[PDB]
């Protein structure tokens, strides 16, 4: 498994990014999710925000629900210095203050980088579209009639409506996995093909 380190920020609502998988991604300030797989460890900044753990600990219970005990969930304090966070991290050093990981306000306004598209070949050929971006990505756009592709900030997602066409649902996967290249995002972003009615527990944690 690759081990991720998330990066969780905000006042009003909270958004998610992956960071490198470093000490020196880390600040005071924030929230961190390092997910090594069947190891996930919430890493509290010495001044993070009560939303800012609050929606880390959600993220933390959707990947235990979906990984099915495979994964184990834990949350350190950052003067904990835990030292198996530090281990999986693969680094230790001194740690940003919340000062130098900027202004949780401004990432509010500034950082809203979850992206909603629909896959839908209804007019005889694949057309794949953005339908919204940042805080307008809504679970009432989602169409039983088509796929929809989300990129959370830290995932793609491929979620196959239950009445898609034979092509969207051949298709869906590929065009979420092409998404990743074109929007120039980190080659090893996860995607994942889920199927609606499904628990889909992190897909499903993105929109509360
Ligand atoms: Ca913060
Ligand atoms: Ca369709
Ligand atoms: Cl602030
Ligand atoms: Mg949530």
């Known amino acids: 498994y690759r081990t991720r380190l998330l990066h969780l920020k905000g006042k009003k609502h909270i958004r998610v990014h992956e ?8 600040n005071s300030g924030d ?6 797989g069947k190891t996930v460890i919430q890493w509290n900044g010495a001044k993070a925000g009560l939303l800012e753990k609050v929606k880390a600990a959600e993220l933390l219970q959707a990947i235990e629900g979906e990984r099915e005990g495979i994964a ?13 966070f530090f281990t999986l991290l693969g680094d230790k ?7 130098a990981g900027g202004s949780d306000l401004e990432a509010d306004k500034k950082d809203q980088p979850a992206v909603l598209l629909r896959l839908s070949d209804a007019s005889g050929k694949f057309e794949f579209t953005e339908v919204a971006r940042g805080l307008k990505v809504k679970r009432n756009l989602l169409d039983s009639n088509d796929v929809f592709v989300l990129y959370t900030g830290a995932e793609v997602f491929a979620w196959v409506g239950k009445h898609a066409s034979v092509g969207e649902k051949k298709k869906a996967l590929s065009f979420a996995q092409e998404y990743v290249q074109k929007a120039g995002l980190p080659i090893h972003t996860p995607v994942a093909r889920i199927l609606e009615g499904g628990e889909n527990e992190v897909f499903e944690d993105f929109f509360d």
């Not at 960071?19 to 880390?26: E, R």
């Not at 929230?31 to 090594?36: I, K, M, R």
């Not at 834990?74 to 198996?84: G, H, I, Q, S």
């Not at 050093?93 to 000062?99: S, V």
């Open 19 to 26: 960071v490198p998988k470093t000490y020196k991604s880390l």
């Open 93 to 99: 050093g001194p740690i940003a203050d919340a000062a």
């Open 31 to 36: 929230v961190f999710v390092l997910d090594a």
């Open 72 to 84: 184990s969930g834990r949350v350190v304090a950052e003067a904990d210095n835990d030292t198996e």
